[PDB]
Design a protein around this ligand. Structure first.
Ligand SMILES: Nc1nc2c(ncn2[C@@H]2O[C@H](COP(=O)(O)OP(=O)(O)OP(=O)(O)O)[C@@H](O)[C@H]2O)c(=O)[nH]1
Ligand SMILES: Nc1ncnc2c1ncn2[C@H]1C[C@H](O)[C@@H](COP(=O)(O)OP(=O)(O)OP(=O)(O)O)O1
Ligand SMILES: Nc1ncnc2c1ncn2[C@H]1C[C@H](O)[C@@H](COP(=O)(O)OP(=O)(O)OP(=O)(O)O)O1
Ligand SMILES: Nc1ncnc2c1ncn2[C@H]1C[C@H](O)[C@@H](COP(=O)(O)OP(=O)(O)OP(=O)(O)O)O1
Ligand SMILES: [Fe+3]
Ligand SMILES: [Fe+3]
Ligand SMILES: [Fe+3]
Ligand SMILES: [Mg+2]
Ligand SMILES: [Mg+2]
Ligand SMILES: [Mg+2]
Lengths: 478, 480, 481, 481
């Protein structure tokens, strides 16, 4: 029956038998072989951690929050059925991540198959369905009081989202949808686990207290719908939650070398895509890019693929294997510099393909010893936000006061502090050069710093040093 | 000989015999009986920690940074004499804190003796001098290669800045970086912060966002304007904005906690009422009061958090007024918090006007029926400045950076060059209002007066304002 | 109303209003001014922590364990009344500690008033009674469903055990005997008091803690043992329980009984003894009490805390000059000097009656070495320290009950043989430290010779450093070669 | 041009890697350790324990540097050069280069079963793989560039790892013998390898670590013992050293030898054995090697990691179906069932020669009620596990040298008597776990009866759960009542 398991982040947690049964399936255990931070392990040697253990922790925390809301407010009529369903959603929320997590849905699939709109979330829904059907879970759900028709829908809806649009639960339990993946503002237990866990393994202490948020969480009526509200005074801690997030993106998740290793692995997958077969349903053969179309195949597609390519001897894989071998020897593409747009210029995702052409096109006003072609440059554009593009997510949180804990309210940015961020979204543009040698790298720097001046981008931090002859050209930089 | 000591923050640290000798003196051991966070212990029950152990840690970290700079750059010619002097400064930097730390220099002395400009730092210099002279330290300094004339000046200068072109008499310009270790006047990045971040977090029950050890690995001395200064690596600029964010965050959560501060004001209140009647024997047997002990260091040595309990346990009828306040803190009959607000636009509230603000709150005429009128002496208004340690200025604009490709060439990094998600301003005010009358009827009235006062002075709407004063918040068009 | 409070060990904990009301009283807030580890702060500069915050944490953990037992086993019929009572006991379990905690009941009172048998626990009962009566708590207890007649008895009984075979407790019946094993476990010593201090003392000391209380709670269960419902642990956890008591003994060796920590304790105690006659503390009806007699009146004892140290230190009364001088020697670090450590051999316990006589014995030893300086008995301090697993000579795991996976209601026993050959052979020993009150180089050498000879004379273990400190004496003993 | 590199380890913080070390690190032979898990199958029981050999290897390298560097500051007379330091760091960094798939499963279970004729250790592999790393990545010129002498130093590095290829070492003279006690201490076992894994395994396992390496370093010192300079610890630290080995044994009991962790190890090993014949790995000159023979060629062994598990799991070849089915049973958690644990009594060791025979013995037991289901010997797994203080039956503290405060160059010994009566009596024992390959309710009951009888038959300790699982058998033994 109930099973205790020792997580270093959360301690000894209990898993209800139904959860154990879901956990002990190929579709779930698959997450033991997919790293949380993708290529980040190749920069932060602590970050060996995989999706499996994150997935357990999200499940656990989903349980804590829903269970706590129920103790504090019986009127909500949260059943142990609701609790199990929320735990299951949490547990299975990342079932559909690919090899190297965010590299797969974020870099690889968009390049290998531009026609498809595919997300790790959609994969989770599909893989959940596959897990359920192939391991006879529906009878076991019934055994512990679930109703598979309704509840499987509710679980899927928690993961990917949908008058009242949800078919899984009624409006009087809309708060249950704000636990595992919060579409309204982003404050969800997924974040809370990864903050704590990624910090543990990364070697960074975490600024944020989930346990305290749970103690000051409460359900109130907002616009004819019951939602999770936080206490008025906690507004500060919530701005700090999203700061913590952006901070972890800057330090670790978007680390300039972590990302170049990601682009190199992605590059290697693209060159191996044609030649690697993965057996799926009915014995049909799938490629790495097409395994997402069949979940029995996708079950077998993990970080393994990296080592399968690396260890191979097939001459068809030589191109892909050479890239991965350059990662072993640490002949990585070289970082040239970082820059941002100015004013209110967003760079459209359509234009990313075109940017290397632009860097090589720049004509710096001294004659150059080495010309470099566009295919020598990589430009990587990265969006940093508070999880809702240009919007302040705290403008989409509801609060309560000590003196009236059932009355929800709003808190604007003025009402909190003048020292908060002015905008909530920006872009970072990193430029790397594929040619490693001393002469090419100098040239690349000159092209880059000029390109920055040409497009009225911010001056590179190191710009005066790396390109001392170019930085006086721009009046705006002096 | 050398002594090893086990600090929970820093681990096993070595104390050079000279340091041990300074440590084992009444003037230093005094810091065992002064709490770091003052009244904060009465809100965060972890925060029992005292200045003693902070003082050791600052000393230790001062040593780490100067010692590391020396390994990485021999050309700087940092002597073991320089290292000891920097450690000593770090160790003794907080020697002059009063009872309840920041309550003393921050609330009490300014009220008891408005004529004096007195800082905890100035006290540290005076108390250092007293420690040296009364415990025969000068011969021991000489024994380990120091030159007391020069070095005592250098130590004092590290603590309070220049005692009177190059302003320092303690060291030459080619060692100006040594002045940026214990107390950094240029930008505020000093080892004092680094210890208290880690230590206060440990005891408070808050995890700390900031890695001092990493800063030390990417620290370096370079020439800036004919003067050798500590520079950080270009890419670390992000972590430095995050250092000051961490600081402001700890002020909001803990150091300026609304009840922590009201306990501070109540203790301060009790000291003021006991000031006339408590005698402290100083030099030559002269009798000093709590407010005047700062004028004589032998007296000040005996002035610690003890004073709280001396007042509490006393039986003298002259202390009954003061003792009653402290007894109300035991029973938890604290002054009640009404709400918080801020100015709008760019209106600073001058420190001269703080005395006048309770008069203003009671003066407000809210269009609500009230049973109970409240007089100005019933209100406490507390104005709190939150900044990045340099009033309105961005301290990162006063940091120097180096690049990987040229590690001796210093540069500057502007705010644009880093991120759009950084703060717009670097200084603000918080205005808390409390009410001395505790009952249900007075507290309601106080809320109405307060929320109206906010509307009257075009301050921000209190977060809870619609709930606590529902009849007043529609009056302001700007809030709808 | 309910109150959330942030402890660095346990996180955000909730305090029921009744608890808040008990907490916000002079008798309880007094614990803010008494240090957990006494003199240990003067050796481990992290250990500033006071009884107040320990007391909260014990209260909290008492709540967790009783609350968990209730979720896992409804049949036990644990009421929210039971829970509050257990929390209150936990919260108030250390109400009666004196200045510098264990120094007071352990060194000072036994010396100042040898006629009395007084424990910190008995004090807790008295001070609880005083807290209740002086702050009108009884109506508030009733308000939240307690029955003060029964429950105040139950609370006191948790703290000190039975107030007067049959069932000895008047506070609860036999079908709830497990409630008595939460705050202070007379059966085996596995209680939530230990669990808080392990974690907390480690946090502040700078030592990581080997023991997981949370795991014990997950594998705890109530079963019938000899017509009485007790807390049982899972069979496989037996290893972790031997490791709990090892952790405890380890913390005693490293920190609580640290050779200098203890000498600072003896010096403070010494100073209190010399100031005892001349310090007045006002009690009930204005009667004046001395430090040693404040334990007889709880209104006086309320005002007796670590303050007393500083009151003595800062004083100018010529009657206190003797006491003040000792405390001033602690500031300057002119501490009594450690000579060495030793143990008895075989199965010889040293009776507590004989402790007074041991300094006389050390000076009496006639070492065959030339000495400049004879030392009198009053120059030596001998400190005898018992190290055990909390139950004198007994193995406390022999007094634990266990359950198996296959039958979780059937209790069993586990012997020492059944666990491991690498466990301790005995569960109690003595340590004998000798210090010398004369500090100079010549006296310290002499003291070493007297000591190492005394060890040989009484067939004690050879001091670790013995060949170095007394090279001329160690060949005399055939048993050491 | 090539420069120092900073890297952020969660255990040790920001550590500096000298360019020579970076160059060794950035090679296929070293990066291979990213794909080998520290605790083997332990990840399948402690979901925190994802950590691999790579990051341990860095940390050992780092700590090797700290200890040697510290000894040099405190005692210049030893004349420790930056050349010595680099060599010690390199040894530390490369000490585990030769671990196989699932770390200790490979050298401990698999190879002994697949190839009983060979004596092969993970250490020997480290030496071979170090040689291969050096030669294939042109390291010798780079060593010279930073002042090493490859002839001498490569020998010294290898000798640190496996011991010696009168004074047996050719790598350094007797006046630097202490350098051999840093990465892998043959004398007593106190080495920086332990110190890293204690801290690291604890971090990831969810257990706090009882032991302070940093403190040991502050109280470490080199002294002359028997015409040879060795690392000595301070007299008073002897307690902490007994606690180091206790910590170690404690981590073995809780985690490394966890009853299910070990059964997953035996199942993976089982699957490798069934796949051994059919999986090819390309080595030097394109020769094909099997999993068991990859140890004979280091270019092949470079490609042999935990991958092999997934290669078997994902495969479609019908020749691998047997092996793949075992691994699939680990996914679904149809593990072999644990029956119970027991130990020998008196001083009876079970010889390693007799391990093959023990399943035969369990099935042979004739319990005095007739059994409905008979079980054959191949249905039982008996796993015998030695728990010690790292030196079989010996106390490693008897092989430590100590110094006193009063004479810090004079080494001494400290016996067990001189420390504590509460220390272990013996320093080595055996654990015998029995599992059953048949999972069903009827077979498991039978297995329990066979097992508990076998315990009685061989005069082993009574299983903790024995009264419950086999209530009809436990009264038969007079010794158990
Ligand atoms: N079942 C399961 N357990 C895991 C997993 N990861 C870690 N564990 C821990 O592994 C422990 C041992 O596994 P169990 O499956 O209980 O194996 P067992 O104890 O032989 O089988 P039971 O009789 O059912 O307890 C559990 O108690 C868990 O805490 C996992 O993926 N599945
Ligand atoms: N076992 C321990 N583990 C961790 N810290 C300890 C331990 N024992 C003592 N400490 C602490 C207390 C001190 O702050 C610091 C040094 O104490 P300790 O090593 O006992 O030196 P000491 O100065 O009393 O001995 P000596 O004078 O004999 O050199 O470490
Ligand atoms: N942001 C924070 N992070 C962590 N701990 C905090 C924070 N703010 C306060 N604490 C600690 C201090 C106290 O121990 C406990 C409660 O603080 P707080 O909730 O503000 O109490 P309070 O009595 O001021 O709230 P209330 O507004 O209900 O009266 O938590
Ligand atoms: N902001 C940070 N806080 C903590 N750790 C960090 C941070 N940034 C990076 N790390 C970790 C990852 C690596 O192990 C180590 C080195 O990171 P980084 O210093 O950015 O190396 P790098 O090689 O990218 O820099 P460079 O090429 O500029 O020398 O620090
Ligand atoms: Fe997630
Ligand atoms: Fe206690
Ligand atoms: Fe190792
Ligand atoms: Mg997701
Ligand atoms: Mg007690
Ligand atoms: Mg090894």
């Amino acid at each position: 029956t109930m099973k205790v398991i020792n997580d270093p982040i959360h301690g000894h947690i209990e898993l209800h038998p139904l959860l154990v049964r879901i956990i002990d399936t190929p579709q779930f255990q698959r997450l033991r072989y997919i790293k949380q931070l993708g290529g980040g392990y190749y920069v932060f040697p602590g970050a060996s951690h995989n999706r499996f253990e994150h997935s357990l922790g999200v499940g656990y925390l989903a349980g804590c929050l829903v269970h706590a809301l129920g103790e504090k407010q019986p009127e909500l009529q949260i059943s142990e059925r609701d609790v199990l369903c929320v735990q299951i959603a949490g547990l299975c929320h990342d079932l559909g991540h690919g090899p190297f997590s965010h590299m797969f849905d974020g870099r690889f699939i968009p390049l290998a198959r531009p026609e498809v709109k595919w997300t790790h979330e959609q994969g989770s829904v599909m893989m959940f369905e596959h897990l359920i059907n192939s391991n006879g879970i529906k009878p076991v759900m019934e055994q512990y009081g679930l109703i598979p028709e309704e509840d499987i829908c509710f679980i899927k809806e928690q993961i990917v989202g949908p008058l009242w649009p949800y078919k899984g639960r009624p409006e009087n339990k809309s708060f249950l949808y704000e636990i595992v993946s919060n579409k309204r503002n982003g404050i969800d237990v997924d974040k809370w686990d990864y903050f704590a866990r990624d910090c543990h393994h990364l070697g960074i202490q975490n600024n944020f207290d989930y346990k305290r948020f749970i103690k000051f969480a409460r359900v109130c009526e907002v616009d004819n719908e019951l939602r999770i509200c936080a206490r008025d005074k906690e507004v500060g801690n919530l701005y700090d939650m999203f700061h913590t997030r952006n901070s972890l993106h800057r330090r670790a998740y978007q680390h300039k070398v972590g990302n170049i290793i990601d682009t190199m692995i992605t590059d290697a997958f693209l060159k191996a895509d044609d030649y690697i077969e993965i057996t799926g349903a009915g014995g049909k053969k799938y490629r790495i890019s097409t395994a997402i179309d069949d979940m029995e195949a996708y079950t077998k597609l993990t970080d393994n693929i990296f080592l399968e390519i690396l260890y191979s001897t097939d001459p068809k894989l030589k191109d892909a294997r050479e890239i991965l071998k350059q990662i072993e020897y640490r002949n990585l593409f070289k970082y040239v510099g970082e820059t941002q747009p100015t004013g209110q210029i967003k760079i459209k995702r359509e234009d990313y393909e075109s940017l290397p052409k632009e860097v090589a096109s720049a004509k710096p006003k001294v004659l150059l010893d080495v010309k470099l072609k566009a295919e020598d440059f990589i430009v990587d554009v990265i969006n940093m936000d508070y999880g809702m593009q240009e919007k302040n997510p705290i403008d989409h949180v509801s609060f309560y006061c000590k003196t009236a804990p059932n009355r929800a309210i709003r808190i604007t940015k003025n009402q909190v502090s003048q020292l908060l961020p002015e905008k909530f979204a920006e872009q970072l543009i990193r430029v790397y050069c594929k040619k490693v040698d001393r002469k090419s790298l100098y040239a690349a720097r000159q092209y880059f710093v000029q390109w920055c001046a040409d497009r009225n981008f911010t001056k590179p931090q190191d710009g005066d040093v790396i390109a001392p002859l170019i930085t006086p050209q721009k009046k705006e930089w002096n």
